[PDB]
Design a protein around this ligand. Structure first.
Ligand SMILES: CN1CC[C@H](Oc2cccc(F)c2)C1=O
Ligand SMILES: CN1CC[C@H](Oc2cccc(F)c2)C1=O
Lengths: 412, 412
């Protein structure tokens, strides 16, 4: 029968910091993590900025010898996973190793590594492709490497659902624990798509903000002058744990995961429906899964990507689900500060939702100078808002019309 | 408690055929799908052969214009998915579309597309990258495109667990139905990694057979002269359906999916443990899930990749799990004929496991001329073996030590 699931550990790399507390300080201070990209020459690209992880030292986590073999998305995923496991206090033993699994996902995975090995192949020949190309690039290897390093013998898998990946990974890992397939899961996502193919590929679709001359103001969810998403790098990991398991070991519990929804739009490969029908269906599924009155929802961490169609679809979805209560909750997009971590977005935003519950504060939507037509909810413009938050909801939507909602609440 | 899950539709592209009955005819005849790779210069490569899909016509499924937007692995996954839904006779309606979902995965995803866009990027610069590069290359676009085309609003996701993808995709879709999150799922996997990057990436790790002189004899699981796996392309999809739902509409039921196991080895990034400890835990997990004694298993579709370490690990795991029953079951590798479809391997082998139940016949392991030391199980050498089969297992083991087992049972 269905068991309860709590959050006992969190870890993060973001454009605002190399761990959770540092990232969260930047979130509450309204700081932007967005800057011109330094790691490559983007003069031929229409977008030349994004949210880089600054000053990451992989030798805080792994030997230089093994790090050299791994794409940055794997390095970031392992860093966030190690932080979350350490933060949990959990001890892996022969007695519990078969009951601890991992589900760390990615939207695109090791695009930097694949681009670099493609360069080798085309300029030199296949004899210059790294022997570590496959295990160092494919998406499941965050889960794989984490399991090898910590001895986790529970369910070992990875989701790839584009910009919904982090939310789906956390939700499905919670279901694993709920249904008794595991007692503990490390779950979240990681992304590092800032290579030529990433910036060039989103750029060819004209999906990215082109505000090169003012990167910190580029990400402006629900602002009338928004012109697309800002591409960002990093990782989020959570340690999810069965309630009675967490209670038995005296774990510090941050919050309870009470609800998870998934819905397909079945609308369009890349565009969200204007009325937010898929996001509404997904949130309704998550609220019914959590056994909630929608009026219990105090805070929504929006997907809020700073796209014309995405941002207004989300307002439509929230008004349709919450009716008059839409005017009482607070909804914000931390992508205003972090940009869009793609497969990692739902993972870092799940952590931000849990911290909104811990600290009783709604993170701001920075850059919301001129709210667009119909964008008339409390979107927490400019400044963090202290308020009562018993229930927080984190939304993600992605290519393929794939939707996820997580519902968290305070645990006493 | 838990609902029962049955298989009501199947679809396939493989090196043996453009559908299930053609592929299965090849399997029972001991035919090889392996041949030198055409329309591609492999001069500088140590492997020049594999399992190609021959004569695939995407315009049976999609307009030329929609097919141009999508990597071959997505085309393949859609073809298998459309076949499986057709084969099921399911009528999608406003009354059931929120109860029908998709989980089609891939191990490596859009390497061919990435390769072609890399070529453009390096030669001409980022303005030649396709606008459809991202949505046409990401692994969740089989689930995304299928849901949009058929109007499916149930759970929409994609697994990526390397060579375990197809097995995990089917098992987790079965859990969705068992626990009431969907009534129908389309599940399986697709792969097309016969590009410079795939053949070069696996070749760089010396993982591939280099028997260029005799491609049809290269894949020789448990044979003392095996020298690595054969890379193959294609797709498998199954329609999974809640039993009462299948019975109410008068569905043709092929078999019941009674068990699913997952385990991590936590051993090595690419190598299995020699004693097959992870595969043994995974099979025991799947049998416990099914409420079956190891003695009830009649047929195992092995991972059986033709690698020195992997093939011997699987013998060890089977001897360990099945004890005095280990010789009574038949265990065969259909990869002897199909080669290794990586993320689709588990999907097409689940289909072969189901057809073994329908037709009461164990597929052969072809090329098993000289069983290796300790390879003394009933490996169905050379020729198909008619036999009693009530319970069939399908095993997948992949990079990151990720394991999957599906247990299928005759249904009447
Ligand atoms: C309404 N719009 C705006 C952008 C999006 O189109 C795309 C298309 C391809 C890749 C991508 F990243 C985005 C859409 O459907
Ligand atoms: C048991 N053996 C044989 C090859 C494999 O090693 C690799 C390593 C990297 C990529 C790959 F494709 C394979 C292994 O560890």
């Amino acid at each position: 029968s269905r068991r309860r699931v709590v959050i006992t550990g969190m870890g993060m790399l973001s454009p605002l910091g190399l761990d959770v507390p540092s990232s969260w300080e930047g979130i509450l201070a309204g700081r932007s993590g967005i800057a011109p990209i330094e790691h490559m020459d983007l003069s031929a690209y229409s977008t030349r900025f994004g949210g880089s992880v600054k000053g990451f030292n992989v030798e805080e986590y792994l030997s230089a010898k093994e790090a050299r073999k791994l794409d940055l998305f794997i390095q970031y995923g392992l860093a966030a996973s190690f932080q979350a496991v350490r933060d949990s206090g959990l001890e892996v033993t022969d007695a519990n190793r078969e009951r601890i699994g991992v589900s760390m996902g990615s939207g695109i995975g090791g695009l930097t590594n694949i681009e670099n090995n493609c360069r080798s192949l085309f300029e030199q020949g296949p004899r210059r492709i790294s022997p570590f190309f496959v295990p160092g690039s494919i998406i499941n290897m965050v889960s794989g490497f984490l399991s090898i390093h910590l001895g986790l013998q529970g369910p070992n898998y990875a989701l790839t659902t584009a910009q919904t990946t982090g939310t789906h990974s956390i939700g499905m890992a919670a279901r694993n624990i709920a249904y008794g397939e595991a007692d503990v899961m490390v779950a979240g996502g990681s992304e590092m798509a800032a290579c030529g193919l990433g910036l060039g590929g989103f750029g060819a679709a004209r999906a990215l903000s082109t505000r090169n001359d003012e990167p910190t103001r580029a990400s402006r969810p629900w602002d009338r002058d928004r012109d697309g998403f800002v591409l960002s790098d990093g990782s989020g990991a959570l340690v999810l744990e069965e309630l009675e398991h967490a209670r038995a070991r005296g774990a510090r519990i941050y919050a309870e995961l009470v609800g998870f929804g998934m819905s397909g739009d079945a609308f369009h490969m890349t565009a969200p429906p204007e009325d937010g029908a898929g996001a509404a269906r997904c949130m309704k599924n998550a609220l019914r899964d959590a056994g909630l009155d929608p009026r219990q929802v105090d805070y929504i961490n929006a997907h809020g990507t700073s796209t014309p169609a995405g941002d207004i679809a989300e307002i439509a979805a929230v008004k349709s689900v919450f009716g008059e209560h839409a005017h009482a909750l607070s909804m914000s997009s931390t992508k205003s500060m972090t940009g869009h971590l793609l497969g990692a977005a739902g993972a870092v935003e799940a952590i931000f939702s849990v911290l909104a519950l811990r600290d009783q504060v709604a993170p701001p939507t920075i850059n919301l100078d001129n709210p667009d037509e119909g964008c008339d909810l409390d979107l927490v413009a400019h400044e963090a808002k202290p308020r009562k938050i018993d229930v927080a909801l984190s939304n993600s939507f992605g290519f393929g019309g794939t939707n996820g909602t997580l519902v968290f609440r305070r645990f006493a």
